[PDB]
Amino acid sequence: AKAKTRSSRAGLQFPVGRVHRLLRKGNYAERVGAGAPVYLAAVLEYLTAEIL
């Protein structure tokens, strides 16, 4: 089997794979819906793009 990054699978650049781990250790919740981080990383890329 071959693996592909999730960021590409969303057509995104920011590290969905990394940021998902952050909420897991961030203790904001005990369980995270897998859909949430993909949404989250998308937001940041929009925000960062807006400023520069």
Binding site for DNA (CB under 7 A): 1, 3-7, 9, 15-18, 20-21, 31
Looking at the Cβ atoms of 31 and 46, the one nearer to DNA is: 31
Minimum Å distance from CB 47 to DNA?
Answer: 20
DSSP state of 14: S
Could you tell me where the DSSP H helices lie in 1-52? 6-9, 16-26, 35-51
CA distance 27 to 22: 9
Minimum Å distance from CB 5 to DNA?
Answer: 4
Minimum Å distance from CB 12 to DNA?
Answer: 10
